[PDB]
Amino acid sequence: PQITLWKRPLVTIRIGGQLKEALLDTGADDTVLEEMNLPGKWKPKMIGGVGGFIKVRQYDQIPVEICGHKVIGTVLVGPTPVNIIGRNLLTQIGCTLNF
């Protein structure tokens, strides 16, 4: 689709078997999801935004479905206030910004 920005650009994703709403976020390097119990190997990481840093669990090579696009990559899990789809996955769905 072509998504305008008058409202937040929210999409449905599926990850670890669960459906979620997430924000398509060109300002995010990495995808970051709210706290959930994902199985798999992970390593700790700190990410910085407005307000400072959060500790996240970094899971590599995770399958995610985003509006019908089946992708595989890194997902960070921790205390973000909103589920965010970052550039690492935006590039896999072929997302561009146009003006």
Ligand X SMILES: CC(C)CN(C[C@@H](O)[C@H](Cc1ccccc1)NC(=O)O[C@H]1CO[C@H]2OCC[C@H]21)S(=O)(=O)c1ccc(N)cc1
Catalytic annotation present for 30: no
78 binds ligand X (CB under 6 A): no
Residues near 97 by beta carbon (within 8 Å), at least 6 away in sequence? 26
46 binds ligand X (CB under 6 A): no
CB of residue 51 to its own copies, shortest distance in Å = 3
Q: Which residues pair with 11 in a beta bridge?
A: 22
CA dist 71 and 87 (Å) reads 12
| Interface positions with its own copies (CB under 8 A) | 1-6, 8-9, 23-29, 32, 47-54, 67, 69, 80-82, 84, 87, 90-91, 93-99
CB of residue 99 to ligand X, shortest distance in Å = 17
Exposure string (b/e) for 8-32, b if CB count within 10 Å is 16 or more? Answer: eeebebebbeeeeebbbbeebebbb
Active-site positions?
Answer: 25
Q: By the criterion CB under 6 A, which residues form the site for ligand X? A: 23, 25, 27-30, 32, 47-50, 81-82, 84, 86
